[PDB]
Amino acid sequence: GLLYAGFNQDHGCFACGMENGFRVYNTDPLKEKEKQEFLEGGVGHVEMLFRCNYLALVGGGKKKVMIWDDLKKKTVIEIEFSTEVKAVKLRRDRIVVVLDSMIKVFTFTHNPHQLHVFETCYNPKGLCVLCPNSNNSLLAFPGTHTGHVQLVDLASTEKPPVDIPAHEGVLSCIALNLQGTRIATASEKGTLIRIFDTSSGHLIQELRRGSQAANIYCINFNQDASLICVSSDHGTVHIFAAEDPKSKWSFSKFQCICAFGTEPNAVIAICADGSYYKFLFNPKGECIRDVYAQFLE
Amino acid sequence: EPVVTQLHPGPIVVRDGYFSRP
């Protein structure tokens, strides 16, 4: 009955959308925090805000967004749209709603109102990243020119946007590091992962997954953005050295969304079929399976 | 034109550390 799963902003937690509601977990160690069997229509998307009491929920038909106060156990805000809502991103002062062709920014008050609209290319995957840091309101998304990422500063919206020619074809994945300073992107060819500085838009690192094609599902940095982990559509997760001088291949591999765990040599993986894996690795790339659990039960 | 609907009077107040670590 699982419809969606995503990590929160520091990957300390993940949240799942169910046909019968939603669930919130602590990532490492795997501990279920809350469950809400109450929504009959289910939720297709769930966004957290670190470990705060609010979640953003995408309704049954994905037409309405619901702001859920879990300390009050109630929807306190509802925003209805005339298009499918593909994704929602939160920071302390902003609610960002991703439609398949545009992104719409609202205040985060008891009665939100619209602030900005941003045209995107066709964005059925709802790709978007939003830094939540107090000193960095970076918002990034697929530009109208296919394969380019547009970077906007929500604290300084009068500027012109930075435009990164990340790929020549359709983007498939975009991730942001914890410091808001690096973005990693991949296209549907999935052959190169490319990491860019967010204030200048210039290439920092390019990694090779393989000459062959495999569809990226998720990318994530570790705490200091010295490693990244990547999951592929044939039950495959690679990790990479992110600040190595030259262009490099995968440090390590193992056999879905993925993030680094509590310990700096730990990696977590959560699968659409209900599986949860924790793996441990070595400076040289040995990958040990540590935990397997069916986290839905 | 999206339709915003408010369903609770008081302000929004971010309570960090709600989903505490085990």
CB atoms within 10 A of CB A182: 20
Q: Torsion angle, CA of A96/A98/A101/A102, rounded to 10 degrees?
A: 0
* Structural domains in chain A (count): 1
Which residues does chain B have within 8 Å of residue A26's beta carbon, measured at their own beta carbons? 19, 21-22
Helices and strands: H and E segment counts in chain B: 0, 1
Residue of chain A nearest B19, judged by CA positions: A51
What whole-number distance in Å separates Cα of residue A115 and Cα of residue A110?
Answer: 15
Please indicate the experimental technique that yielded this structure: X-ray
What whole-number distance in Å separates Cα of residue A117 and Cα of residue A152?
Answer: 12
The burial of A17, by beta-carbon neighbours within 10 Å (0-12 exposed, 13-18 middle, 19 or more buried), is given as: buried
Domain coverage including residue A203: 1-297
Structure tokens at A3: 């419809």
Contact at CB, B11 and A109, closer than 8 angstroms: yes
Which residues does chain A have within 8 Å of residue B11's beta carbon, measured at their own beta carbons? 109-110
The minimum CA-CA distance between B15 and chain A, rounded to whole Å, is 5
Structure tokens at A187: 């296209």
Q: Torsion angle, CA of A244/A246/A252/A255, rounded to 10 degrees?
A: 120
Residue corresponding to tokens 């991103």: A89
What whole-number distance in Å separates Cα of residue A32 and Cα of residue A200?
Answer: 40
The candidate with the shortest Cα–Cα distance to B4, out of A97, A237, A127, is A97
Resolution in Å equals 2.2
